[PDB]
Structure formats: C-alpha cells, structure tokens
Design a protein around this nucleic acid. Structure first.
Ligand SMILES: NCCOCCOCCOCCC(=O)O
Ligand SMILES: [Ca+2]
Ligand SMILES: [Ca+2]
Ligand SMILES: [Ca+2]
Ligand SMILES: [Ca+2]
Length: 757
DNA sequence: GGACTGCTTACCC
DNA sequence: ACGGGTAAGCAGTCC
C-alpha cells in the first residue's frame, strides 16, 4: 500500500519518493523519470518558440521552459489542442506562471497549481491505501503547565503520554510511583525518551487529538527552547507545520499523522468536542478531565500527581482507541478520492470532490478548468433557487408516512445529463430543458460528471452485493465504509456545481438540478393529494409527511404503498419515490421543526431546540420532556407540570450550573463582526486576557443575574463559580425554558404566563 | 417605548 | 472551507 508521495532535491534534480508498505516492511521507492508540466492556449503555433524564450528567476537561479509539446486534449468535452511546457524542478512551475500567462499572444494557462507529489499520484494512476497490510499506530498526548494566557510554549511539558496495541505509558520528570509512568530526570530527558520510544516502536501512523494545532506545535516551541532535534520522521526529519487555510496541519514525513479532531468534528455532532466528550459519545464509557489549575497545583505541590498521570495515560489510551476506530474508514476515503489519508483527513468535501475530478479528468484526457481568481469569485456571487419547503399543517397528527425520492439530486444529474460539458451545446439530436431556469442539456453523450456519478452509484450497489456475500465481518465493515462514503461523494456533486470556488462550477447546472427537484416533489404532492385522498402535513426538498385524516394505520400504510406503485412508473429516468417511515403520531411546528414517535416508541426530532447546540441543556431537556408528554403519552397536564417544576427549580436557584451552559461558535476574526452577540462580547473579553479566540472556537458561557444587554452579564462556564455569582433565573426561565416549551405547548392554547413558575 | 430590520448561528435536506 | 431555505434571538434603529 502506497502511504504517500513526496519529492526531495538530490544533486539539483527532483526525486519523487513513493512511501509504501509491502510484505510487513516500509519501503521508499524513488523516481526521477517524472517531470512537472503546465498547459497554455496559444493563438498561433508560431508564437510557441517565441514563448519558449520566457524567463523568470527563483532565488539565485534563472529558470525557463525545459521542454514544450503541442498536446491534443479535450475541454468541457470539445477537443482543444494546447502546449504542455515542462520545467527542471517543480518549484519553477509557480515562478514563471504570471509572466508566461500575461504574454500578449496567449489566452490562458491550465493545470498550473497541482502539487507535484499529488500530480505524480494522479498521472502514474496510483491509489493510496490499496491492499490489506496491517499498519502499526501509536497514539500520543502532552500535558503542559500553561499559565494565564502566556505565550504558546513558554510553559514546559510536564508529561508525554503514548498508547498502542500493547500498552499506555507516561514519560514525566516529577516522581510518580505508578507502573505506567517512567520518570526521566528533566523535561529534555522525557522528550528524548519519547523520541527514542517512537524510533524503537517505528509506527506507520501517529494518532493525535488536535495534534495539527497544539500537541506538535507545542513540542516544537519546547524542542526549540531546549535545543533537542525533534526528529520523528523515518527519513530522520523533524515535523513540517504546513499552513492549511485558517489553521495549520503537521506532517511527519514517512509516518501518517492522523489528527482525529478534524475527522471527529466532520463525522460526529456534539455541543463541545473535548476528547472526554467524544469518548463518552463513540464508546459510551466516561472520562474525568484533570484541568490546568489541577495539573499545575500537582506540579507545584507534588501532592496528587497520580491523578494527572492517570489523565495523561487515559488521554493517550482513548486517542489510540478513537484512532483504531476512525482510521479504517478514513483509509477507504484515501482510496476512493485517491489521495493520502493525511490530505483526505483534513480536506473539505469541496476539495475531496475536486481531487476526484482531476484524477478522472486526467484519465479522461480533459484539461481541468482553473480555480477562480479574486475577480472570478465576485461575478459567481449571485445565488439561485433551492428546494421546495411546504409550510406545515401545524399540530398533532396520527398515522403519518414519510415518502422521499431515493438519491434525488444524483438521479436528476444522471437522468437529465446535467453537466457543464453538456450545457446548451450546438446541434445535439435530443435535449432536456430544465423546468424554470430553462437551460437545455445535451442528451447524445454521457456528460463528464453524470458519467462518473453513474459509475459511483453503479459500484455502490456492487459493494452492497459484495457486502451480503462477505463472511469476514471486518471486510463487511470496510465494505460498508466504501459504500457509505461513495453515497456522500455522489450526494456532494450538486453542491460542488453551486460552489463558486469549485473548478467545475456551473450555476447553470446547480440551478437546473434544484429546479427539477421542485418540479418532481410538487408533482408527487399534487398527485398524492388529488388522485389519492392523502393530506400532506409537511414537505422539504424531496421528502413528504402525509396521512389520510381519520383512517387507521393499516390503511394509511396500504394506500401509501399503493400510491408508490402508481407514481413511480410515471416518474422519469432514475427518479423513484420510496416509503421510508410510518409514525403512530407526529407534531409539525414550523418549517424545519417537527417530531414523530414510531410504532416501537422512538421519538425522532428535527430542528426544534432539543437538537440545537446553541440552546441551554435545561431548555432542551425541558422541551424534550414536554415533547415526550404530548407524543409518547397524551398528558398535556403531565407536560404543563414538567414545565412548572423546571421553572420554580430555576427560580429557586436549585438548577445545576452545568445545565445552564450556552455553546455557540465564533465563525470569523473578532474584529470583522458588525454586531456584538453575548458570545462575541464574551470572546472579545477573553482576547483582552490573551486567550486563543480564533475561528472554530466554541464559546461556553452562563448569563449572570442583572438587567440591560445579555452579553454584559455573559461570563465563561469555566470562570463561573456558585459562591458570590448567582445565575440569571429571569433570562433562563423567560428567554429559554419557557419559549421552547411554549412552541410545543402553544398548539394546546397555553399562555406563557399560564406556565408561570 | 413598541415595532421594524438587520446580524448571526446552527439546522434541515 | 463549501448548496439554498429556514427559525430564531440579540441588539440597535426607527418614528
Ligand atoms: N445534501 C443534499 C441536499 O439534500 C437533498 C436530498 O438528498 C437526499 C438524497 O436521498 C438519499 C436518501 C434516500 O435514498 O432516500
Ligand atoms: Ca423523518
Ligand atoms: Ca433509500
Ligand atoms: Ca457541499
Ligand atoms: Ca451558502
């Protein structure tokens, strides 16, 4: 299996290394046969020799086109001939672009921003993480004595925790009499031991939880301040702290640095992404957090460091266990997108998509269109019409059925051949004209995207057939990851079309996909309500909730199943309505906000406060209980009581602090905000105390008692103490518990005052 | 001082 | 990172 590709510079020329693992041994296959290329559309072939003269200096050296070649490719299908120009070293490719492009002869340059190492993986037709070889992994973690908003790394590391198949251990330089702790004499000593341990183990994967943004970065500032060669890489190198967008990411050349945090953050939904939280999520089992004030007083005291040791050891043990659980599917994704586990782990779907298309586009002799420059985002700023969202028949309904289109937007993209290279072409025999946008789509050749999108679904069903056959239950998991991922990639394509930053942007395509959607859902709804006696209680972009008012569950079921057999043959192409759910009763509140209880009893909840991270756990727990009341049982009494108790409990300051925490995200840099929400108010103050309030940072806070603007009383959850700081019982009763509860209890004509306290 | 209006977050699909 | 459609609430800005 190819772990990753990278290139060095031996004797001047670039050598592409293809880091692999065959027959239980890590190998580094070198390659100098590959040479970098770029593309350009010249108006006259005569100018090529004039353009070959173009020069540009990189550092001390002067650099010009090492070779040149007329290449016959395609572009949005249409055959185009263009000049592919080589270069000695890949780093010359980005020096000579602006000049070679500006040229008054040439119209444009193409494929000029594809990292060599990644170019080589695409072109050579190699796919990472193919074939079944066990890869050794090593989780690691650090405990720091971080002072009150001091410089990053100006505190020393107290412990380094590591865990793998066989053991968890702590390396530390204060004395702890425990079997899983190794005391070195000094900080430098315990790092040098850690570094040794990694070497002696020689793991393929290094698992961290936010290693990208803290653990590795901190180890550097230390190894810097202490003069220790921080050599973790197999080549003997130290880690490269590459800067991806808003944050950074760390690469250990020769090892897969698997930072779980971005994966966990992408995959699981939680209010807070503490390693303690995600263990309790993924595995159900609990985890104590030893806090900084706790660690430092243990260091300073020498009293009760054994807890801090248990914490370090647990931190690593849980990192490993999360790694061994998440790496598998993150590896299937390495293979599907055909780039390194590393890149894939940290990438947007936007990029994962573009990486797939570039690979397919090269294989398909298609000159990939260029990312849009600053000015070419500004024009793309115009939006388009989305999905149909019916205003719900509000209130409590019985015997409901969820009907939805199986893979709607892909079915449309497949069916109507919706693709930039099929959009309003000259003289196709047959054409498909989108319902309102109007745009005609050629129907004579399988369009680039529809082509690949079919292959994807084509395979996904193959993989689900191989699944029912699979004896080995591991493979059946690794198989299910492959199919589940393909579904997500396939469902990402419509999005990519509407994405201004997307190479294959096509507002014409996205708009047409959504247009068709609106047509098809409203036609089902119309058909379902007219032909069959159903009322549609609510609907939203490919999904419908419906009943036959005053009919038994038995009948609703039969008639819905009957309606599918009616409509489905009337629907065109891959477009197919499915019966997905039946629900004893259901409660539709506003658009995006409803709950339903199934026959077995499982209440499902959408959009309501209960499932929002930016609402107090007392708001949600209260709403969740008033909702159980109306749905699971019938007791609107039982409900109004659950409300009344929940309020008096808050009014009598008996409500736990923990349940009063409000989690919202700072989205951008604190200066850019036009308005100051309590969370910005709170985040702004924490920046006057030199805290790291950057994009993605979740602000937790409690509204303290008083009057005026809510943000002036908002103080962080950590910082809140019960002694001498009461919570705002008024706000918490009047602005959270009551408003949410009222939403559900409003349908039974209860005044907010009526809920009282 | 009550109602409009914009800002911001997170959800649904 | 990121598709559009939507419910909300906080906190100004009218008139
Ligand atoms: N994220 C895309 C916006 O949602 C549009 C709806 O797509 C859902 C695709 O159906 C899959 C479920 C099924 O097979 O019934
Ligand atoms: Ca549902
Ligand atoms: Ca289905
Ligand atoms: Ca998207
Ligand atoms: Ca958007």
């Amino acid at each position: 299996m190819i772990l990753d590709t990278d290139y060095i510079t031996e004797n001047g020329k670039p050598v592409i290394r293809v880091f692999k693992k065959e027959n239980g041994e890590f190998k580094i296959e070198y390659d100098r046969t590959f040479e970098p290329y770029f593309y350009a559309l010249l108006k006259d072939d005569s100018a090529i020799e004039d353009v070959k003269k173009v020069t540009a200096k990189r550092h001390g050296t002067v650099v010009k086109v090492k070779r040149a070649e007329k290449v016959q490719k395609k572009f949005l299908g249409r055959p185009i001939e263009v000049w592919k120009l080589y270069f000695n070293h890949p780093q010359d490719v980005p020096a000579i672009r602006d000049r070679i492009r500006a040229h008054p002869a040439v119209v444009d340059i193409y494929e000029y921003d594809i990292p060599f190492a990644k170019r080589y993986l695409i072109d050579k037709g190699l796919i990472p993480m193919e074939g079944d070889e066990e890869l050794t992994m090593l989780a690691f973690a650090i405990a720091t004595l971080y002072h009150e908003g001091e410089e990053f790394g100006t505190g020393p590391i107290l412990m380094i925790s590591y865990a793998d198949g066989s053991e968890a251990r702590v390396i530390t330089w204060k004395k702890i009499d425990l079997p899983y702790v190794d005391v070195v004499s000094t900080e430098k000593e315990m790092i040098k031991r850690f570094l040794r341990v990694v070497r002696e183990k020689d793991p393929d994967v290094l698992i961290t939880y936010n290693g990208d943004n803290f653990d590795f970065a901190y180890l550097k500032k230390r190894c810097e301040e202490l003069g220790i060669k921080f050599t973790l890489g197999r080549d003997g190198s130290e880690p490269k702290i590459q800067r991806m967008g808003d944050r950074f990411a760390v690469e250990v050349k020769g090892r897969i640095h698997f930072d779980l945090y971005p994966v966990i953050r992408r995959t699981i939904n939680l209010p807070t992404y503490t390693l303690e939280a995600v263990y309790e999520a993924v595995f159900g089992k609990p985890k104590e957090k030893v806090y900084a004030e706790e660690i430092a007083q243990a260091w300073e005291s020498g009293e009760g460091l054994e807890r801090v040791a248990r914490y370090s050891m647990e931190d690593a043990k849980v990192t490993y266990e999360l790694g061994r659980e998440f790496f598998p599917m993150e590896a299937q994704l390495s293979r599907l997108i055909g780039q390194s586990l590393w890149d894939v782990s940290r990438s947007s779907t936007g990029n994962l998509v573009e990486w797939f298309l570039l690979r397919k586009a090269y294989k398909r002799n298609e000159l990939a269109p260029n990312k849009p420059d600053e000015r070419e985002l500004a024009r793309r700023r115009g939006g388009y019409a989305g999905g149909y969202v019916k205003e719900p028949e509000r209130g409590l309904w019985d015997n409901i059925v969820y009907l939805d289109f199986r893979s709607l937007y892909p079915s449309i993209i497949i069916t109507h051949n919706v693709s930039p290279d099929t959009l309003n072409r000259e003289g196709c025999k047959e054409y498909d004209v989108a319902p309102e946008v109007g745009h005609k789509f050629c129907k004579d050749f399988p369009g680039f995207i529809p082509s690949l999108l079919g292959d994807l679904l084509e395979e996904r069903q193959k993989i689900k057939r191989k699944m029912k056959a699979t004896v080995d239950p591991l493979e059946k998991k690794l198989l299910d990851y492959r199919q589940r991922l393909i579904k997500i990639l396939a469902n990402s394509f419509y999005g990519y079309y509407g994405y201004a930053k997307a190479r294959w942007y096509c507002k014409e395509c996205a708009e047409s996909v959504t247009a068709w959607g609106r047509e098809y859902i409203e036609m089902v709804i119309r058909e379902l309500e007219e032909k069959f006696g159903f009322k549609v209680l609510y609907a939203d972009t490919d999904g419908l909730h419906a009943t036959i008012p005053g009919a038994d569950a038995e009948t609703v079921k039969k008639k819905a199943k009957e309606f599918l057999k009616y409509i489905n043959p009337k629907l065109p192409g891959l477009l197919e309505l499915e019966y997905e759910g039946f629900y004893v009763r259901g409660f539709f509140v506003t658009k995006k906000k409803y709950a339903v209880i199934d026959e077995e009893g499982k209440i499902t909840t959408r959009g309501l406060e209960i499932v929002r991270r930016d609402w107090s756990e007392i708001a949600k727990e209260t709403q969740a209980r008033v909702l159980e009341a109306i749905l699971k049982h019938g007791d609107v009494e039982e409900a109004v009581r659950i409300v009344k108790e929940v309020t008096e409990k808050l009014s009598k300051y008996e409500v736990p602090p923990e349940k009063l925490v409000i989690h919202e995200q700072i989205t951008r840099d604190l200066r850019d905000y036009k308005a100051t929400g309590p969370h910005v108010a709170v985040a702004k103050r924490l920046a006057a105390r030199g805290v790291k309030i950057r994009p993605g940072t979740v602000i937790s806070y409690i509204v303290l008692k008083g009057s005026g603007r809510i943000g002036d009383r908002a103080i962080p959850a950590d910082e809140f103490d019960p002694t001498k700081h009461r919570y705002d019982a008024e706000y918490y009763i009047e602005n959270q518990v009551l408003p949410a509860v009222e939403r559900i209890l409003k349908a039974f004509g209860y005044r907010k005052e009526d809920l009282r306290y």
